[PDB]
Amino acid sequence: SKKLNKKVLKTVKKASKAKNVKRGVKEVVKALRKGEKGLVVIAGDISPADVISHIPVLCEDHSVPYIFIPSKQDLGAAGATKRPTSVVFIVPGSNKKKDGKNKEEEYKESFNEVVKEVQAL
């Protein structure tokens, strides 16, 4: 499992600089509302009744790909090292990068893997 958080934090961290991640309650509701979602990164260290209640609700409602990562360094380095949070929503979307020679390849792959795994489990 330890490796999971690694590969995960790495994927999101890479996309974070590629403008593919969206943190903040606002970005969350918007990602699930506009349909522009990807991976719900939750801070294992910070998770109030809000996330603990929305987790089973949003999951049992639509079953969105939500993952947890107990590591402030990760959640922060992914969302914003300067302004870290506990609720983040990744959005691996690329039009040209999809078929272009970019990190999107390994990124999307590794991401879809970790994400899919979290959903199934």
Swiss-Prot record:
Keywords: Nucleus, Ribonucleoprotein, Ribosome biogenesis, RNA-binding, rRNA processing
A GO cellular-component term linked to this record: nucleolus
Annotated GO MF terms: box H/ACA snoRNA binding
Signal peptide per UniProt: none
Localisation: Nucleus, Nucleolus
Gene Ontology BP, a term: rRNA pseudouridine synthesis
Homology family: Belongs to the eukaryotic ribosomal protein eL8 family.
Role: Non-catalytic component of the H/ACA small nucleolar ribonucleoprotein (H/ACA snoRNP), which catalyzes pseudouridylation of rRNA and is required for ribosome biogenesis. This involves the isomerization of uridine such that the ribose is subsequently attached to C5, instead of the normal N1. Pseudouridine ('psi') residues may serve to stabilize the conformation of rRNAs. The H/ACA snoRNP complex also mediates pseudouridylation of other types of RNAs. The H/ACA snoRNP complex mediates pseudouridylation at position 93 in U2 snRNA. Essential for growth. Directly binds H/ACA snoRNAs.
Subunit structure as annotated in this protein's UniProt entry: Component of the small nucleolar ribonucleoprotein particles containing H/ACA-type snoRNAs (H/ACA snoRNPs). The protein component of the H/ACA snoRNP contains CBF5, GAR1, NHP2 and NOP10. The complex contains a stable core composed of CBF5 and NOP10, to which GAR1 and NHP2 subsequently bind. Interacts with SHQ1. Interacts with NAF1.
Protein name in the entry: H/ACA ribonucleoprotein complex subunit NHP2
Source organism (scientific name): Saccharomyces cerevisiae (strain ATCC 204508 / S288c)
Gene transcribed to yield this protein: NHP2
Residues of the full protein shown: 36 to 156 of 156
